[PDB]
Scaffold this active site. Structure first.
Site, mmCIF file in Angstrom:
data_model
loop_
_atom_site.group_PDB
_atom_site.id
_atom_site.type_symbol
_atom_site.label_atom_id
_atom_site.label_comp_id
_atom_site.label_asym_id
_atom_site.label_seq_id
_atom_site.Cartn_x
_atom_site.Cartn_y
_atom_site.Cartn_z
ATOM 1 N N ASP A 282 12.387 9.512 12.425
ATOM 2 C CA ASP A 282 11.512 8.755 11.545
ATOM 3 C C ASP A 282 10.106 8.873 12.113
ATOM 4 O O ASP A 282 9.811 8.230 13.110
ATOM 5 C CB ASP A 282 11.977 7.308 11.429
ATOM 6 C CG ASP A 282 11.078 6.390 10.616
ATOM 7 O OD1 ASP A 282 9.994 6.837 10.213
ATOM 8 O OD2 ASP A 282 11.486 5.241 10.383
ATOM 9 N N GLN B 192 12.643 1.410 6.089
ATOM 10 C CA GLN B 192 12.126 2.768 6.022
ATOM 11 C C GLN B 192 11.915 3.317 7.433
ATOM 12 O O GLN B 192 11.850 2.546 8.384
ATOM 13 C CB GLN B 192 10.818 2.722 5.238
ATOM 14 C CG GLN B 192 11.000 2.389 3.762
ATOM 15 C CD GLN B 192 11.540 3.536 2.935
ATOM 16 O OE1 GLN B 192 11.928 4.595 3.444
ATOM 17 N NE2 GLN B 192 11.598 3.331 1.626
ATOM 18 N N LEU C 233 0.831 -1.198 0.000
ATOM 19 C CA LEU C 233 0.000 0.000 0.000
ATOM 20 C C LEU C 233 0.868 1.252 0.000
ATOM 21 O O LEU C 233 1.872 1.297 0.708
ATOM 22 C CB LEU C 233 -0.870 -0.039 1.255
ATOM 23 C CG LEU C 233 -1.916 1.071 1.388
ATOM 24 C CD1 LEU C 233 -3.096 0.775 0.487
ATOM 25 C CD2 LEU C 233 -2.368 1.189 2.838
ATOM 26 N N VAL D 254 16.180 4.400 8.744
ATOM 27 C CA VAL D 254 16.099 4.714 10.163
ATOM 28 C C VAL D 254 15.295 3.618 10.863
ATOM 29 O O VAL D 254 14.148 3.341 10.509
ATOM 30 C CB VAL D 254 15.498 6.104 10.439
ATOM 31 C CG1 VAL D 254 15.383 6.366 11.939
ATOM 32 C CG2 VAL D 254 16.303 7.208 9.759
ATOM 33 N N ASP E 123 9.833 -0.595 8.981
ATOM 34 C CA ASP E 123 11.173 -1.111 9.231
ATOM 35 C C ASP E 123 11.451 -2.340 8.368
ATOM 36 O O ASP E 123 12.600 -2.609 8.014
ATOM 37 C CB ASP E 123 11.364 -1.525 10.679
ATOM 38 C CG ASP E 123 11.478 -0.413 11.703
ATOM 39 O OD1 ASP E 123 11.932 0.700 11.339
ATOM 40 O OD2 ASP E 123 11.071 -0.672 12.849
ATOM 41 N N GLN F 209 0.787 -5.561 1.357
ATOM 42 C CA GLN F 209 -0.189 -5.946 0.345
ATOM 43 C C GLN F 209 0.480 -6.629 -0.853
ATOM 44 O O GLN F 209 -0.159 -7.415 -1.555
ATOM 45 C CB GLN F 209 -1.021 -4.746 -0.104
ATOM 46 C CG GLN F 209 -2.180 -5.126 -1.013
ATOM 47 C CD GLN F 209 -2.996 -3.936 -1.451
ATOM 48 O OE1 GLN F 209 -2.710 -2.788 -1.101
ATOM 49 N NE2 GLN F 209 -4.021 -4.222 -2.242
ATOM 50 N N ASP G 82 18.666 -5.769 11.091
ATOM 51 C CA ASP G 82 18.946 -5.161 9.802
ATOM 52 C C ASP G 82 18.147 -5.879 8.715
ATOM 53 O O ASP G 82 18.442 -7.026 8.377
ATOM 54 C CB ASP G 82 20.437 -5.213 9.493
ATOM 55 C CG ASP G 82 20.831 -4.732 8.105
ATOM 56 O OD1 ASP G 82 19.981 -4.125 7.425
ATOM 57 O OD2 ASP G 82 21.992 -4.974 7.709
HETATM 58 CA CA LIG Z 1 11.883 2.946 10.754
#
Ligand SMILES: [Ca+2]
Length: 319
Positions: free
Chosen positions: A241, A291, A16, A295, A287, A87, A302
């Site tokens: 973030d 994103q 999305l 951050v 995350d 999605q 990771d």
């Molecule tokens: Ca983040």
């Protein structure tokens, strides 16, 4: 090196709001295509409607199918590995169901296979609209955002269709329409089989989920939640973030709607599909795609390394 060099090309499939590159300059899968390519992967990133259903003639599923065909034509490959976020996992399931011969594997990351309690909440709010005007205008803001930020300014944007698609009732219908051996029984909060064979075509099925948002206290009808991805209070991610505190907020709504542990918009139970590699990642929903712009809370894994390791896993599995 060739650590991530799968037999079949990898296609990353956004969810999305998404596109391959927001405004043509910011990758949805932040840092990930570059990392995989450095490790010898042949990686393509689909560019679909940010807001649509997955089924239907104008939906994301048919868009992804067309892109898959282009990738196969470009590469000379016979099949692709689909890795879908949110999605995009549903979209990937669509293509695996309608064109099973073109797919080698389906991996879903934080995919609402059973829908989202947050989508139910938003839909429930809009249900009080007496005319449809408020709903139309809300949708227009979102549709405009989609067309503005899509790398090719795709105008096929339908925010209300996207919302409906991510509700729990609609997801249940979707699963009846597009069943997979990778899904456990409705209501079970279990996964299904690690593989499926469909029309003579075998697919390896995988998933993982983020569960940063954890229920805490419970008293007199109220449940607390905490973001386990972050140093309490003063984690840099809370400052740098905006999605961090936002997804704690939505995740708290979710726990108060019976979701259990979640990533801010998708519950652990909803995310279960195929071979479940882990549901323990201390990630909120974005995350999972590294994103915003890399951050993450101090306690987050990771995602670049996780996806890279999965590309290697796919290679070892023969796809
Ligand atoms: Ca983040």
């Amino acid at each position: 090196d060739d650590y991530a060099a799968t037999r079949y090309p990898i296609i990353l499939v956004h969810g999305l709001t998404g596109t391959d590159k927001y405004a043509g300059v910011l990758d949805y899968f932040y840092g990930i295509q570059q990392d995989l390519q450095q490790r010898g992967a042949n990686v393509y990133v689909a560019n679909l409607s940010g807001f649509q259903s997955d089924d239907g003639p104008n939906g994301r599923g048919e868009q992804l199918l067309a892109y898959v065909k282009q990738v196969l034509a470009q590469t000379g490959a016979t099949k692709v590995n689909l890795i879908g976020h949110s999605q995009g996992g549903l979209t990937s399931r669509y293509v695996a169901a309608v064109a099973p011969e073109l797919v080698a594997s389906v991996t879903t990351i934080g995919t609402p296979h059973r829908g989202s309690e947050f989508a139910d909440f938003v839909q429930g709010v809009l249900a009080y609209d007496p005319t449809g005007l408020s709903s139309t205008v809300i949708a227009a803001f979102v549709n405009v955002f989609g067309a503005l930020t899509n790398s090719t300014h795709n105008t096929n944007q339908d925010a209300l269709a996207a919302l409906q698609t991510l509700t729990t009732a609609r997801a249940a219908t979707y699963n009846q329409n597009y069943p997979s051996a990778g899904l456990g029984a409705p209501g079970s909060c279990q996964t299904g089989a690690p593989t499926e064979t469909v029309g003579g075509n075998t697919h390896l099925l995988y998933s993982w989920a983020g569960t940063a948002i954890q229920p805490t206290f419970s008293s007199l009808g109220v449940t607390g939640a905490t973001d386990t991805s972050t140093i309490p209070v003063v984690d840099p991610a809370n400052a740098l973030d905006a999605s961090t505190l936002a997804l704690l907020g939505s995740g708290t709504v979710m726990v108060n709607r019976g979701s259990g542990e979640n990533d801010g918009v998708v519950s652990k139970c909803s995310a279960l599909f195929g071979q479940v590699l882990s549901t323990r990642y201390k990630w909120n929903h974005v995350d999972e795609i590294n994103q915003l712009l890399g951050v993450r809370g101090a306690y987050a894994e990771d995602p670049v390394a996780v996806i890279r390791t999965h590309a290697n896993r796919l290679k070892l599995a023969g796809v």
